[PDB]
């Protein structure tokens, strides 16, 4: 609609992103599985996990796609899928002033080719993805813990990992050192059931 409350929609960028998505899909049909353009003008290309290096290198070097900056590299844990981990690449093209997204999938065991050779920024991002989710990146120059504790066990950002973890630290006078002990909370984290029983958005209604 219109009037101040609604957010204005730009059709020109939508058309341009759709055209470029078709372009990328045509150039790389071996790995591109799906192409979407969100209503707020963000382009997403869905790539088979073997296409990480080819598609990213194309999007970095191609004259019509100079995504020379790796904006972000994250993972999304959806434990309801066979490949729960969803690796997302955020790219920036300073030449054409636009951004693109590349999404792949991987299991808890199947490794993913490391995009360090494509973007040197992907090093610490892949280290963080490994530390937080457990995804292994093959051909990675140095894969190890980056954010968790040194002797930490488990990958916290997984959906099945407890919020408070399994272990806690404290100082013991007997051993003269900080010791890890199973987590016991003085007050339990009060889980809230907040979802309303009524459908909010009819436009996203899944088939019965």
């Amino acid at each position: 609609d219109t009037r101040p409350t609604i957010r204005p929609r730009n059709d020109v960028v939508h058309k341009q992103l759709s055209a470029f998505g078709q372009y990328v899909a045509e150039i790389l049909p071996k790995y591109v599985q799906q192409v979407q353009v969100s209503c707020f003008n963000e382009l997403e290309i869905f790539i088979h996990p073997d296409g990480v290096i080819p598609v990213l290198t194309f999007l970095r070097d191609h004259t019509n796609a100079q995504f020379k900056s790796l904006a972000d590299l994250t993972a999304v844990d959806v434990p309801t899928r066979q490949n729960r981990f969803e690796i997302v690449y955020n790219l920036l093209s300073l030449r054409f002033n636009s951004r693109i997204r590349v999404k792949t999938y991987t299991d808890e065991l199947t490794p993913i080719e490391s995009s360090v050779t494509v973007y040197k920024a992907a090093n610490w991002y892949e280290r963080e993805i490994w530390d937080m989710f457990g995804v292994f990146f093959a051909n990675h120059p140095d894969l190890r813990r980056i954010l968790t504790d040194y002797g930490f066990e488990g990958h916290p950002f997984r959906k099945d990992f407890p919020l408070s973890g399994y272990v806690e630290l404290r100082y013991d006078d007997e051993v003269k050192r900080v010791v890890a002990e199973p987590v016991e909370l003085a007050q339990e984290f009060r889980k809230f059931d907040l979802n309303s029983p009524w459908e909010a958005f009819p436009a996203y209604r899944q088939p019965p």
Partner: protein
């Protein structure tokens, strides 16, 4: 499924043995450098114990991942990225012994 480092359990077992040799030959340095108050046997037995915990594993992909995590733990110990607190966390000392007998569990609490 696509393998990680090995295609057979025999190949995977080879990497486990290589990790064990590295761990076994590191324990004397770990006690010396970290100034641990344990014996070399205790550390080497502890290494054996942690290896024996993951002895039922049969999937080579999981075996490779365990060795990958095993090398990462060794690198922190060699580089002294871990501290004496981290090294001595395997030797649970402040934790009280939790009996595994039913009658003992029944006396303590509602633990199933």
């Amino acid at each position: 499924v696509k393998p990680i480092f090995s295609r057979d359990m025999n190949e995977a077992k080879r990497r486990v043995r290589e990790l064990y040799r590295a761990w076994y030959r590191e324990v004397p340095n770990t006690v010396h450098l970290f100034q641990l108050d344990i014996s070399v046997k205790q550390g080497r037995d502890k290494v054996r114990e942690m290896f024996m915990k993951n002895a039922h594993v049969t999937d080579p992909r999981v075996v490779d991942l365990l060795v990958i995590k095993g090398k990462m733990e060794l690198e922190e110990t060699i580089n002294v990225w871990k501290q004496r607190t981290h090294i001595m966390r395997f030797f649970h000392e402040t934790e009280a012994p939790r009996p595994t007998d039913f009658l003992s569990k029944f006396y303590v609490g509602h633990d199933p």
